[PDB]
Amino acid sequence: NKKVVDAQKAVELFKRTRTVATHRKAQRAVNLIHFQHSYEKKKLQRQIDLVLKYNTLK
Amino acid sequence: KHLIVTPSGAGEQNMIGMTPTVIAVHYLDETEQWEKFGLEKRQGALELIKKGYTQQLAFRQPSSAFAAFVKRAPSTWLTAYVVKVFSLAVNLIAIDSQVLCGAVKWLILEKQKPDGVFQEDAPVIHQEMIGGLRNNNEKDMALTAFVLISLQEAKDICEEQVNSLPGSITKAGDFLEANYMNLQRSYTVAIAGYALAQMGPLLNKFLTTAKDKNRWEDPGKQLYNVEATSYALLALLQLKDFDFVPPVVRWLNEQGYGSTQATFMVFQALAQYQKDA
Numbered sequence: 001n002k003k004v005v006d007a008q009k010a011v012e013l014f015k016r017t018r019t020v021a022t023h024r025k026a027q028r029a030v031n032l033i034h035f036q037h038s039y040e041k042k043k044l045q046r047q048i049d050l051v052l053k054y055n056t057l058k
Numbered sequence: 059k060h061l062i063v064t065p066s067g068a069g070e071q072n073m074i075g076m077t078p079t080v081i082a083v084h085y086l087d088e089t090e091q092w093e094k095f096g097l098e099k100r101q102g103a104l105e106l107i108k109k110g111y112t113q114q115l116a117f118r119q120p121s122s123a124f125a126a127f128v129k130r131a132p133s134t135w136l137t138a139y140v141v142k143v144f145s146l147a148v149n150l151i152a153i154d155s156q157v158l159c160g161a162v163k164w165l166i167l168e169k170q171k172p173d174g175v176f177q178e179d180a181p182v183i184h185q186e187m188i189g190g191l192r193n194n195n196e197k198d199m200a201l202t203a204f205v206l207i208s209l210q211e212a213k214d215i216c217e218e219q220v221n222s223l224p225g226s227i228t229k230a231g232d233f234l235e236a237n238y239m240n241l242q243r244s245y246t247v248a249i250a251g252y253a254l255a256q257m258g259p260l261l262n263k264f265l266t267t268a269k270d271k272n273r274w275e276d277p278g279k280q281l282y283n284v285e286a287t288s289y290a291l292l293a294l295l296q297l298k299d300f301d302f303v304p305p306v307v308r309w310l311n312e313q314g315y316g317s318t319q320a321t322f323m324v325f326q327a328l329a330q331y332q333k334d335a
Contacts, residue, residue, distance in 0.1 A: 020087055020090070020092060020100070024087060024149040024150075025149075027148065027149055027150065027151065027152070028148050028149045030152070031148045031152065031153045031155060031215075032148075032155070032215075033155075034155045034156070034159075034218070034219055036154055036155075036156050045152055048152075052101055052104060053101070056097055056098055056100075056101070057100065058090075058092055058093070058097065058100075
């Protein structure tokens with residue numbers, strides 16, 4: 001499924017870049033995955049939350 | 059720095075405190091001023107936005123609509139309202155697309171009259187939270203422009219999961235177009251304007267209704283015009299007519315309780331601006 005890969009490519013760049021821009025892109029990518037019970041969904045959401053908690057984007 | 063309010067209360071009252079917080083961050087993101095606002099604040103803001111979201115899901119009825127209380131009759135405006143705040147926050151926090159599409163799907167199958175008129179059967183208790191749409195006069199054109207505008211801020215999100223969405227859009231958009239010429243309140247013209255600009259004579263109508271060519275004001279509560287002028291400002295940007303935009307924006311810059319809509323729209327207008335021009 002493209003949407004998971006997309007969300008993946010978006011979260012990976014965010015983990016490395018750590019910016020307000022990359023975050024907006026990563027969160028929306030994950031949200032776009034309409035299958036809520038997807039596990040790559042919760043897992044990928046987790047990486048998002050982990051950067052936000054220990055980092056100051058931008 | 060005052061727009062960071064900790065959300066709480068029931069279905070409506072939770073959104074009143076959530077709104078400022080969501081748009082605040084929204085603006086700071088588009089205009090990229092976090093460095094000037096406070097670079098360390100953005101997280102605490104997101105956390106709060108996360109709290110309000112959740113606190114809101116609790117007031118989500120089985121049919122996917124919203125209201126102040128689970129027992130209260132669903133409200134077309136609030137349901138539509140939750141939709142736009144949330145559609146704006148898919149770039150701020152986690153948002154279940156199922157919730158947004160669920161609410162949009164309801165707003166059509168049971169709140170859009172056979173002629174593209176979205177109706178409100180169970181009003182919100184806090185009438186002040188709905189900006190100028192409170193002005194009874196021209197309710198059908200207004201409440202329909204509001205719902206539509208939300209559905210537009212939710213297109214990208216639910217464009218693949220809702221079949222009716224596109225038919226509802228067109229069936230709604232016409233209603234406003236068939237009766238655009240018959241509008242006397244700048245507000246309805248200002249809000250439905252953006253509504254239409256989102257999809258000739260109408261467009262000439264959208265301009266000459268603007269007093270001094272820099273504000274859509276009407277004989278009352280200024281806050282209503284702030285809102286009015288905002289929807290319209292977003293109207294301009296949709297046509298990129300950055301021609302008459304400078305004044306409008308200039309007038310907005312030179313411009314709590316009952317400020318939900320203006321706070322939301324104004325900053326969203328001044329945001330879509332920094333972005334589009």
